[PDB]
Amino acid sequence: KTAVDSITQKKFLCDRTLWRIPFSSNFMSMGALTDLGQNLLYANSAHALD
Amino acid sequence: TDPAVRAALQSQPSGLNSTDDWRQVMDRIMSLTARNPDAFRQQPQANRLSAILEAVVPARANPTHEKVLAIVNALAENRAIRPDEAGLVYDALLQRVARYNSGNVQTNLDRLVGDVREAVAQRERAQQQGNLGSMVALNAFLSTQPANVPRGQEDYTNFVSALRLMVTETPQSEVYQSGPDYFFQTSRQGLQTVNLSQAFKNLQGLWGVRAPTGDRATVSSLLTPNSRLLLLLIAPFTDSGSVSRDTYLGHLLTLYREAIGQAHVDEHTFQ
Numbered sequence: 001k002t003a004v005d006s007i008t009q010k011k012f013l014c015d016r017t018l019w020r021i022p023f024s025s026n027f028m029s030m031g032a033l034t035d036l037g038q039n040l041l042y043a044n045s046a047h048a049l050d
Numbered sequence: 051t052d053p054a055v056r057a058a059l060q061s062q063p064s065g066l067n068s069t070d071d072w073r074q075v076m077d078r079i080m081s082l083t084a085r086n087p088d089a090f091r092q093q094p095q096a097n098r099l100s101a102i103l104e105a106v107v108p109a110r111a112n113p114t115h116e117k118v119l120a121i122v123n124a125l126a127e128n129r130a131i132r133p134d135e136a137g138l139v140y141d142a143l144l145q146r147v148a149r150y151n152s153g154n155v156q157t158n159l160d161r162l163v164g165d166v167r168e169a170v171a172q173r174e175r176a177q178q179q180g181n182l183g184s185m186v187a188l189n190a191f192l193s194t195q196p197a198n199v200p201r202g203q204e205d206y207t208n209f210v211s212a213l214r215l216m217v218t219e220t221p222q223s224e225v226y227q228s229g230p231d232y233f234f235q236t237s238r239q240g241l242q243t244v245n246l247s248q249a250f251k252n253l254q255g256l257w258g259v260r261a262p263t264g265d266r267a268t269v270s271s272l273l274t275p276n277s278r279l280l281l282l283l284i285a286p287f288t289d290s291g292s293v294s295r296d297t298y299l300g301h302l303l304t305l306y307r308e309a310i311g312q313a314h315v316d317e318h319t320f321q
Contacts, residue, residue: 038094038095038096039095
C-alpha cells in the first residue's frame with residue numbers, strides 16, 4: 001500500500017567478450033577475407049583513419 | 051603408381067592446374083574453354099585479379115628439386131638404393147648440386163633425367179624380354195660340355211637346341227653357376243631346380259643306344275630323378291619328331307608332351 005515513487009535504472013553486463021565491427025558490407029561473416037577487404041586491395045591507395 | 055620416373059616424380063613436385071601450363075589457364079580465363087565457359091567470369095575479385103596478374107607476368111620457378119627428385123626416384127625404382135636410402139640420398143644429391151651449381155650442371159641434370167627415364171624403361175622391358183644373362187650363362191655351360199656324342203648325335207644336338215629355346219622363350223627363368231656346376235631354376239623364388247651339369251653327365255650315356263632298349267625296363271634305373279625332372283621341364287618344347295622316336299628318351303618326351311597337352315587344353319576350356 002505504501003510503496004514509494006519509483007524511478008527505473010537499466011544497465012547490462014557483457015563480460016569475457018569483445019565488441020566486433022566486421023569490415024564487410026552487410027556485417028556478416030561471409031568469408032575469412034571480407035568483400036570490402038577485397039575491394040580495397042590491389043587499389044594501391046593509402047587511406048587515413050580516424 | 052607409374053613406372054616412368056618422370057611421371058612418378060611429377061606427381062610429387064607440382065600444383066594442380068597452376069600457371070605451369072600457361073596456355074590452359076589463359077584459355078580458361080578469357081572464354082575459350084568450351085567444357086564450362088563463364089566459370090572464371092564469376093569468381094570473386096581477388097581471385098580473379100590474382101590469376102590475371104599471374105598470367106600477364108609469369109613468375110619464375112626453380113626446377114632443381116624436381117630434376118633431383120626425378121633422378122632419385124629413378125634410382126629407387128631401379129634397385130640402386132633402398133627407399134630409406136632414397137630419402138637420404140635425395141638430400142645428399144641436393145647438397146652436392148647446391149655446392150657446385152652452374153648452368154652446365156643444370157644442363158647435365160636434364161640430360162641425366164632423360165637418361166634415367168630411358169634406363170628404367172629399358173630395364174623393365176629387358177626383364178620382361180628374356181634375361182640375356184641366363185642365355186650367356188647357358189652358352190658358357192654348353193661350351194664347357196662336349197659337343198660330340200659317340201652313340202648318336204642328331205638327338206643330342208636337337209635336345210641342346212631345344213634346351214636353348216626353352217631358356218630363351220620363358221623369361222623369369224634363371225640359369226647360373228653356384229658351385230662347380232650349372233643349374234636351372236624355372237623361376238625366382240621357385241622350386242624345380244635342376245642340376246644341369248649332373249643331368250648332362252648322366253644323360254651322356256643314354257643318347258644313341260636307348261632306342262632299342264626302350265621296350266625293356268632293364269636300364270630304366272640309369273635315369274637319375276634329377277634328369278627326369280630336366281626332361282619333364284622340356285616336354286612342351288622338343289615337339290614330335292625333334293627327338294627320334296622309339297627311344298627311351300624319346301618315349302618319355304612323347305608321353306610327357308601328350309600329358310601336358312591334354313591338360314592345358316582342358317584347362318583353358320574350364321567351365
